[model samples]
Target: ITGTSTVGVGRGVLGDQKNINTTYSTYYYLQDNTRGNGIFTYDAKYRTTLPGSLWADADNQFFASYDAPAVDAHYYAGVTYDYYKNVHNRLSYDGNNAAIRSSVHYSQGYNNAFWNGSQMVYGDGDGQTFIPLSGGIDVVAHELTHAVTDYTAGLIYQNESGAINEAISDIFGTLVEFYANKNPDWEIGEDVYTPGISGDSLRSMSDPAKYGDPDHYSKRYTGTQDNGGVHINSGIINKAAYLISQGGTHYGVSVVGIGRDKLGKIFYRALTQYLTPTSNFSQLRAAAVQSATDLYGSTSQEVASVKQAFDAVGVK
Candidate 1:
């Protein structure tokens, strides 16, 4: 399902379309032509054509049938890879020009997507209510950012570290969506669900409470769903990042301050420059504050606003 015959004929006629060719092949060729260029190369032995198998499909749970799994997967991967390179100035997932491999149609009726410690995997949704996971840009960025987290702070996925890990991914995933101009609405999974879901997305940065969940932090934020509530608790940091970046009101408090790009730079700098393997929320908060102080001066309104945003989210 690459495209209709008209598109195929147009592509054939435009034989030397550099933009099209480069857009589609540059990353793929870079990985194929050079050794270790990709973050992960295809391992046929462990690979399967089913989307659910790409995830933790041992129990034969996840599944989906897509009209264009490969095309969508490729585009999603390319967009994510480009977002890292252009926005964060990082080469690949490992920051060493490592290549990335992605597989689609992993298992039967798999409703989730993830990074399996090496590569990105997608599942065709059950279609009764959800669509293929690759249909959403944030989903791709979310899973790939897991790889980024693994390569960076390597936060232990159990306690606060797990929450931080998921937060970081959601933060950057939202940034990727912003960078790609997919939609500036700040809602996640809007494009991956079936028609008429009653809500805009799975998560909301502008107003997390709209999803019928807590928008701020609490002691009982951690649990089992999505890796110890990693996905749910992420709203705290996600809204924090959003407020820091976009300068908006949270719970009726105005957060007028620096733009999103600057805020992202601060977080990115903190993650790559100051964080370590065992870093947790406290450490991340400290690093972000440090980054703000370094970039905008200790007494600058930007730094104050950042700290305020963090505090507003109950990060202390």
Candidate 2:
């Protein structure tokens, strides 16, 4: 609901206005594609003629060039909707029949995408470097997960809370990507950039060290980047979850597990059912341990491995 504004004849409370049929302006795209497969093709002419006014409203400038924002939005919405329903047994964004709305081609040459509160807003990337924000499944999941976070823990976007918010998004974003079987690489937004640019991901769960950064966790590393480094520091937790599922060596110990999907289920349960917005690293450790115990029982190796992986990440 972040990026949408209500229009048409709607009732206004407190006698503000009645039967006022007004067209509320917001960022979105109207598509006329006849293709049923829902794949969008880039058009150069549409990009060149995007209005200056549209460019002024977008966070990214490149959105003006893409004529297929609706296509991307439609696909993302369907995927996310199906994910929640099939995987988590939830109905739409809320537990009820909430209609999901998305806006594509938000602005000309914008670089970032976000969910405002009502709708998902996408930016066309700066064409020279990035393409469009709606180009990737992970990116779509990332924004939609923000809504899920807001509804659930409402994690404060600062310190540890910020990290949790970012971590949850990244966690589920990867799950969605894997669910779609859209390659196993850990990169985010790889589809939005040109081939010549450095297309590495924002975070890597398989091997955070592969990105020329350390794999371990440290409090000193927190609060160094975006939103107290929530986006950067989340690598620690992301790696923790990844290693737990994939059975990898970390902190001089080897972990064993079924797969990434199972591990994601455990984490998702812990985050949604046991953890709170105010939970810190230690709290997360305890909650995850409890979640593992509840989900797999005390004698299960899966539980032990999950707990061990948390310890390996310095969660204690």
Candidate 3:
């Protein structure tokens, strides 16, 4: 992936034509050579393995109807990169511009995607459950944010800390969706989840209880399943994030809306500077207060709103 960087136009899994960043040496390649690992994408070809062959094309054009997953996987990866660098001023997931990698079409009817602590992995989910996961920018960003958490906070993948970790991904993932202006909402994975289903999302940040997730601390899962309900209990923090940005009342508690831009600033600062590897909900509240204090002073309504949001969700 050298000589020159070019743009490749193609239709994605959802049949939407879009442009992607690519590089050309002799033939058009999926390598961007812009971000970490330069946004490499591989075709697993229905098998579970390491990075597969680089997706190569005859020309820079990639409109083949069959290349949908590859096209979106490649394009959305670039968008995530831009989201981090342009918004947070961070370079790649490691914040050092580490090369990012992804594999598509992994296994038969796979229904999930993950970060694997290093590279992003996607499955062409069972059509009933999901489509090409990369088709969802929020999903793409959500997985990549795991890498960010891995490198920065090193939040253990269990119990309360793990829930905090998962919430961080959901929060930023939703923000990236809004940042891209991709018909943003407080829901996650609606774009790639159950294509035949309507108004259903993988998770709801606005109201985690919509999908049986806890919207309040007392409702948090206590069972030692799902890594201490990391995915399930994330609803508590997710609710706090929604309240901080959008603001609302729940269970007789209220928080003033502070807006998404400030919400991101506070959370990003907390994630990068305040959070420790094992920080839990109470610790997370302290981190947010400190972050907002640093950004908008201790007495500012921004900081007050951060406290109110957490309290509204019964975090403290």
Cα-based TM-score, every candidate: 0.79, 0.76, 0.97
Best by lDDT: 3
Q: In candidate 1, what are the lDDT values of residues 77-107, reduced to their tens digit? A: 6677788888888877898877667676666
In terms of lDDT, model 3 sits at: 0.90
Better of 2 and 3 by lDDT: 3
**Which 10 consecutive positions of candidate 2 have the poorest summed lDDT?**
12-21
- Model 2 lDDT per residue over 207-304, tens place: 66665433566642643567676766677777777778777788787778657667777777777787777887678778778888888887888788
lDDT of each: 0.64, 0.61, 0.90
The ten-residue window of minimal lDDT in model 1 covers: 5-14
lDDT of 1 at 77: 62
- Over 100-214, each residue of candidate 3 has an lDDT whose tens digit, in order, gives 8888888999999999976888999989999989889899889999999998888999999999999999999999999989689999999999999899999999989999999
lDDT preference between candidates 1 and 2, better one: 1
lDDT of 1: 0.64
lDDT, model 1, position 112: 77
- Pairwise TM-score winner, candidates 1 and 2: 1
